[PDB]
């Protein structure tokens, strides 16, 4: 395992925080947020 690992424990940042050096990145950051919020709104187990 010292020669072939995997990720075991994780601390997270929301994906939208990465958007950088693309056209309209400023807006795309918020839109990827609202899209993630809406993704979570589809995906949240509360529907089940």
């Amino acid at each position: 395992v010292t020669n072939l690992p995997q990720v075991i424990k994780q601390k997270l940042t929301p994906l939208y925080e990465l958007v950088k050096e693309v056209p309209c990145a400023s807006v795309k950051k918020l839109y990827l947020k609202w899209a993630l919020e809406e993704y979570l709104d589809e995906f949240d187990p509360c529907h089940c």
Binding site: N3, L4, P5, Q6
Partner: protein
């Protein structure tokens, strides 16, 4: 065997399409209407007929190769790839007349194992790689150093990540059930006088025993993960050349051959693995009856005596092993009937690193490859290909195939349906077995194509297929009826 074989039928032909402006040919096709089965005769005829044309409609087929035309293959390559010391054209054309060559890769670098195998599209319905769609020998500059263990590798331009993602599961179960019964019942009666006498006897036994042993052990080993890029893809030239040969007119047969040659969908994300499934299944039974009786009279005298004794013992046992990655020396010893000693298992998994199968995969429809930077009139070729892809799924989906005996599974390769037979039954339809009965798993007939627009419906039945005959398993895997908006 209870058979009369089904010979192939294709339909009567379509009308011709009008002549294509760019391919300068016209096409006619037939649907596969009934597959070859029970060794009934094939009628395949390579599923198509085509003819030349004399029409003069304008054509815009000259989508510009901006870089350099690969003289044999008809690929284009960007000008920084000429004289990179690598074959970007397929036929080494790009490296002709190099006033100098510049190398990039500082060391030898293996292809990741199976990376050229992942390069081919799948027929999603046979679940098979068909043929080559993306050029996994193309390196776009590349030469970035990647490592697995201490081995070093080159990543094909088409691939986002190949990484070990090195995960393993083992799941084991053992089960035993046993049950025993024994019953003994007797009678005795007597009389005497001074002359006469009488006697009677019965003794009995009934007995039973049962056992099962069931064992299942599965391991899934997942020591690479592949993801293909979403788009900006570089195509394998043999695919690219059938795509440049598709009509802009619609006539399903020429589009059908692309799915036959290059698959229905391209593999976009896959986990790459070895599997070692082992199952051992045993049912055992025993029974006995013993019975013994006498009768006597005395006055002169008479005796009667009887014995009846019986035994049965049986085992039915099945074992299956499937292994799907590794090297042939390990693979055969794992494939041996005995539960593998952990040394074998070690050397097998070590070789899975060098020859994986696909474990689980997410696929995209092949028309997302068809692109305006690669083909003229691309969007018409896409719309055509989307329609043909739907019609092709209706042909390749197994549902046409008459049901196998012995719970056999159809996969419908080419234009023949062949029933894969489980352990314990044999022959063309999987009829021939020593066993009394087998549970059957359900699948539908082919679904009704659509109802009218303004709300549209599809419907399915299981009339022969159904589980209840000889007490089968699950009937279902999806919705027994289906409906949608027209737009």
């Amino acid at each position: 065997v209870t058979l009369m074989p089904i010979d192939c039928e294709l339909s009567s032909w379509s009308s011709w399409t009008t002549c294509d402006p760019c391919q300068k040919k016209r096409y006619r096709y037939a649907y596969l209407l009934q597959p070859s089965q029970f060794h009934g005769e094939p009628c395949n005829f390579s599923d198509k007929e085509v003819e030349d044309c004399v029409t003069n409609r304008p054509c815009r087929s000259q989508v510009r190769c901006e870089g350099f035309v690969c003289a044999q293959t008809g690929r284009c390559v960007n000008r920084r790839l000429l004289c990179n010391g690598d074959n970007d054209c397929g036929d080494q054309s790009d490296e002709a007349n190099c006033r100098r060559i510049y190398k990039k890769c500082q060391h030898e670098m293996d292809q990741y194992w199976g990376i050229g195998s992942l390069a081919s599209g799948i027929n999603l319905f046979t679940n098979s790689f068909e043929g080559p769609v993306l050029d996994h020998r193309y390196y776009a500059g590349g030469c970035s150093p990647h490592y697995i263990l201490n081995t070093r590798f080159r990543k094909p331009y088409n691939v986002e990540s190949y990484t070990p993602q090195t995960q393993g599961k083992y799941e084991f179960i053992l089960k035993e059930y046993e049950s025993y019964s024994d019953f003994e019942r007797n009678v005795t009666e007597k009389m005497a006088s001074k002359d006469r006498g009488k006697h009677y006897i019965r003794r009995t036994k009934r007995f039973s025993h049962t056992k099962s042993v069931f064992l299942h052990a599965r391991s899934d080993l997942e020591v690479a993960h592949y993801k293909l890029k979403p788009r900006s893809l570089m195509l394998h030239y043999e695919f690219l050349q059938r795509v440049k040969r598709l009509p802009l007119e619609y006539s399903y047969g020429e589009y059908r051959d692309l799915f036959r040659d290059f698959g229905t969908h391209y593999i976009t994300e896959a986990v790459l693995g070895g599997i070692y499934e082992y199952t051992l299944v045993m049912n055992k039974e025993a029974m006995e009856r013993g019975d013994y009786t006498l009768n006597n009279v005395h006055a002169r005298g008479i005796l009667n005596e009887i014995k009846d004794r019986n035994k049965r013992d049986t085992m039915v046992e099945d074992l299956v092993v499937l292994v799907r990655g590794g090297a042939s020396e390990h693979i055969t010893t794992l494939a041996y009937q005995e539960l593998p000693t952990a040394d074998l298992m070690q050397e097998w998994g070590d070789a899975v690193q060098y020859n994986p199968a696909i474990i689980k995969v997410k696929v995209e429809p092949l028309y997302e490859l068809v692109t305006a930077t690669d083909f003229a009139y691309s969007s018409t070729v896409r719309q055509n290909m989307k329609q043909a892809l739907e019609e092709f799924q209706k042909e390749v989906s197994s549902c046409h195939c008459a049901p196998c005996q012995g719970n056999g599974v159809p996969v419908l390769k080419g234009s023949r349906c062949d029933c894969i037979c489980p352990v314990g039954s044999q022959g063309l339809a999987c009829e021939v077995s020593y066993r009394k009965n087998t549970p059957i798993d359900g699948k539908w007939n082919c679904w009704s194509n659509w109802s009218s627009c303004s709300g549209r419906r599809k419907t399915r039945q299981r009339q022969c297929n159904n589980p209840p005959p000889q007490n089968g398993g699950s009937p279902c895997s999806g919705p027994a009826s289906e409906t949608l908006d027209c737009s």
